[PDB]
Amino acid sequence: TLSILVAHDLQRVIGFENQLPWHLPNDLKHVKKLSTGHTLVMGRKTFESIGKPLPNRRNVVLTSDTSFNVEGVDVIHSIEDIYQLPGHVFIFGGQTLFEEMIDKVDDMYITVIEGKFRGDTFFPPYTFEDWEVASSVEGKLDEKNTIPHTFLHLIRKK
Numbered sequence: 194t195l196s197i198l199v200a201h202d203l204q205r206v207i208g209f210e211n212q213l214p215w216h217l218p219n220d221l222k223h224v225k226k227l228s229t230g231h232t233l234v235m236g237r238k239t240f241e242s243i244g245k246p247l248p249n250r251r252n253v254v255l256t257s258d259t260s261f262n263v264e265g266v267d268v269i270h271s272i273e274d275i276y277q278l279p280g281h282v283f284i285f286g287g288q289t290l291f292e293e294m295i296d297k298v299d300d301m302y303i304t305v306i307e308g309k310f311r312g313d314t315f316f317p318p319y320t321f322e323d324w325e326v327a328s329s330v331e332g333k334l335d336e337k338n339t340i341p342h343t344f345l346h347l348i349r350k351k
């Protein structure tokens with residue numbers, strides 16, 4: 194499978210100043226669940242944001258930089274390289290990757306953050322005319338997760 198994995202808010206903000214605008218442990222545990230044992234593909238800036246590879250899965254960074262060679266990370270240098278990765282591949286960010294891949298992926302795992310944040314990076318617009326809701330699960334609120342949020346699994350129609 195080729196999947197998108199993304200959290201975006203009511204206006205499709207994904208980012209601010211190279212960070213997530215929200216603090217939401219549950220969603221990061223969501224990410225852990227989904228992608229552990231599989232492969233994440235991410236652009237260089239996103240990799241730089243996270244700082245190092247995520248444990249217990251394959252980390253692939255897409256970059257133009259041929260100097261790039263990082264302990265625990267596989268480098269690719271074209272979009273086309275994605276399609277030769279074995280396994281369940283998650284497109285993991287950021288704006289540029291999402292824009293490039295959204296028409297290409299089988300399905301999307303979206304966490305809708307039910308707020309409006311200040312952002313400088315965005316998920317591309319999409320229509321539910323194009324995308325079937327395989328599931329929609331309200332995330333649980335509590336002391337440490339205080340933003341309402343919904344896990345969507347969408348699958349391309351037709």
Ligand SMILES: NC(=O)C1=CN([C@@H]2O[C@H](COP(=O)(O)OP(=O)(O)OC[C@H]3O[C@@H](n4cnc5c(N)ncnc54)[C@H](OP(=O)(O)O)[C@@H]3O)[C@@H](O)[C@H]2O)C=CC1
Pocket residue numbers: 198199200201206207208209210211212213235236237238239240242255256257258270271272285286287288289290291293314
């Ligand atoms: N909310 C969420 O689920 C997520 C949000 N984010 C947010 O997104 C923002 C980052 O997005 P964005 O600025 O687009 O950066 P990206 O993470 O998408 O990285 C951009 C870089 O990726 C490399 N790249 C992209 N496409 C190609 C290509 N076709 N060929 C070769 N290299 C390529 C380039 O690296 P280079 O210049 O080195 O060649 C490019 O500069 C951050 O604010 C982050 O917080 C990130 C992940 C998830």
Ligand SMILES: COc1cc(Cc2cnc(N)nc2N)c2c(c1OC)O[C@H](C1CC1)C=C2
Pocket residue numbers: 198199200208211212213220221224239242243247284285286304
């Ligand atoms: C841009 O910043 C992040 C993007 C992301 C990417 C990301 C976050 N959330 C969702 N739902 N999808 C995504 N693709 C993450 C993230 C980020 O900040 C650390 O944190 C954690 C990593 C283990 C430390 C996980 C994801």
